[PDB]
Structures are given as C-alpha cells and as structure tokens.
Amino acid sequence: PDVYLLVNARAADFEDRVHSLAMLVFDSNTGEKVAEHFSSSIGSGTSTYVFTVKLKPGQRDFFFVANIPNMQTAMASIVNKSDMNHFMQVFRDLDPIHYHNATNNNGFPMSRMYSNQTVTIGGTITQPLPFKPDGENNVKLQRVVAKLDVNIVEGVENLQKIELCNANVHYRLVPNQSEPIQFYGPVELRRVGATNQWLGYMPEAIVESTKWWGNTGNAENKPINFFRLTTRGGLVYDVPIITHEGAIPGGQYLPFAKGLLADKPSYTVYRNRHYIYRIKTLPDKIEVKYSICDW
C-alpha cells in the first residue's frame, strides 16, 4: 500500500538560489534506499521546489543536498544509508568564488536531513499527503557557509582594505565535530557597490573551546577566523570572529574577542549564520559592534 508525498523545499538573491536538489530516502532501520528524486532549474534561478514522490510507508531518513556539482551522477553511487552518511560527511573544498559570492549559475551548497520520520499510508498522485519534516511545513535547506557582513559606519575614507583570514578550506554537508584540517588563503572582501558594506562567506569552522586568540598553539591563530582591516596609513587591525549570543562580557567586543578577559568566547563559525560588524575607523583606533543572527 503506497504513499504519495508532496515535498516542498526551500532555502532557510544569488545567496538563496537552489539550482539543483537531490532527495534520497532510506529505511531508518534497514538502511535500504526507498525513494530518490532530482530537481534542477534550467534557470534563471528558483529558491523553492515542490514535487510529488511515491514510496512505501514506514520509518524513513530523508536527505536533501542542493547545488552539489553532478549530484545526479553521485546518487547512483549512494546505494544505502551507510553510503549516504559517508557522502554527507565528506570534506569538500569550497569553490574559490564562494568566499566572495554566489553567482547566477553557481549557488552555495546546502543540505538538510531528517531522521526517523514516520511516513503514513495515503495520498494519491494528484492529491498527495504534504510531507511535514519534524512537524514543519517545509523542508528548509541550510547553507554550508556563514555570511560575514562588515559595515563601516564612520571613517570609510581611512580604509584601504578588508581581508578574511584563516577560513576553512572545506565544507561539509552535515555539521563538523572537529577543527579544520586545511585553511584558505586571505580573502579580500567584496564591497557592495558604492555602499559602506563589505561581504564575504566561509565554511563552518569548529574551534575547540580550550583555545582562544593568542592561545591556539599556532602562530597564525589557526583555526580562529578573523578579518583584517588595513587603513590607508598602513595601520592593521585584526578582529577575531566569534559566536556569542546576548551581552558581551565587559561590553566591548574587541577585548572579549581577543581573549583578554576571564571569560573566553566561542570562536566556532556556524553554518547558515550571519555575522554582522559595525565598525568606526578613527585616526588611531577602531570601534567594533557585533551581532549574530539567522541568515
């Protein structure tokens, strides 16, 4: 007795485009592949896919992978759930252009997985049952990168350039449990037109919480991500990137971020989060305000 499922998927506008989407479904217990589907947009670029799939009922693990080169071919070498999990765990080198931007034809890798979903009997090919992953209405894809958003609220006349340093070389389609093994060279951020906003992107990067700025065991402070501001005077400022919700201990971002206080930050950069800096460039110093939010 079958199930017809209506799958609605979307990213959680080059940053939002989903050019291809693979769905692979496995029996949660046996690991058998029980359904798969591939979608692509000839163009110009959609952010959502809606489609119907037929499968047998039971307990199912759903895997969604977007914007992976030749994912359709890859699906044939994913025979069972064990293969599928290995595939999700691969360290993949981020396309060089993606530290700067997604493009019209090359979107950010995205994924999502939902385990042990109860798929019940029913639906028809014309009237399918809506797929409700973990009770939600939509499949919500997570980008594998974070967005770095640097805004010069004052003193942009003094700015020569901004670079993202120690970015992870690799992304992973499921969250990282270990620090990066390899690091990308410096990325000069891209100015949004003639505004005072600079952008870049980088893969998720785990940093052990036993480390802090100036105490990583590494002269370059790897694996801590930071951005470097260079002024026309040739002054340089390094701003470590952290993940911190709520009020900053001591009220000043830089001393906290630089590991100068008893409380140390988390330096992990998480996928699909938005790191926003508001910077004032004064003659002899900078001031930095910070927030982290969803993308």
Residue numbers in the entry: 34 to 45, 59 to 341
Q: Can I see the authors' text?
A:
P. gingivalis displays two forms of fimbriae on its surface, FimA and Mfa1, both of which are crucial for attachment to other bacteria in the oral biofilm and to the host cells. In the work presented herein we have determined the crystal structures of the shaft protein Mfa1, in both mature and precursor forms, the anchor protein Mfa2 and a truncated precursor form of the tip protein, Mfa3. The resulting mature protein thereby has an empty position in the first β-sheet that a β-strand donated from another fimbrial protein presumably fills in order to polymerize the individual proteins into a polymeric fimbria.
The precursor form (pMfa3), but not the mature form of Mfa3, exhibited a high level of expression, could be readily purified and was used for crystallization screening. The pMfa3 construct encompassing residues 23–446 was however recalcitrant to crystallization. Instead, in situ limited proteolysis with α-chymotrypsin yielded rod-like crystals with a maximum diffraction limit of approximately 1.9 Å resolution. The asymmetric unit contained two identical molecules of which the 105 C-terminal residues were truncated due to the protease treatment. The refined Mfa3 model includes residues 33–341 and represents a two-domain protein with an elongated shape, 75 × 35 × 30 Å, similarly to Mfa1 and Mfa2. In Mfa3 the corresponding residues are Leu38, Val40 and Ala42, immediately followed by Arg43, the recognition site for RgpA/B cleavage. The amino acid that is recognized by RgpA/B for cleavage of Mfa3 is Arg4312; it is located at the end of the β1-strand and not exposed on the loop. Similar to the shaft proteins, Mfa3 has a tryptophan, Trp341, located in a pocket formed between the N- and C-domains. As in Mfa1, the tryptophan forms a π-cation stacking with an arginine, Arg189, which is locked in position by Asp62 from the β1β2-loop. Instead, Trp341 is the final residue modelled on Mfa3; the full-length protein comprises an additional 105 residues.
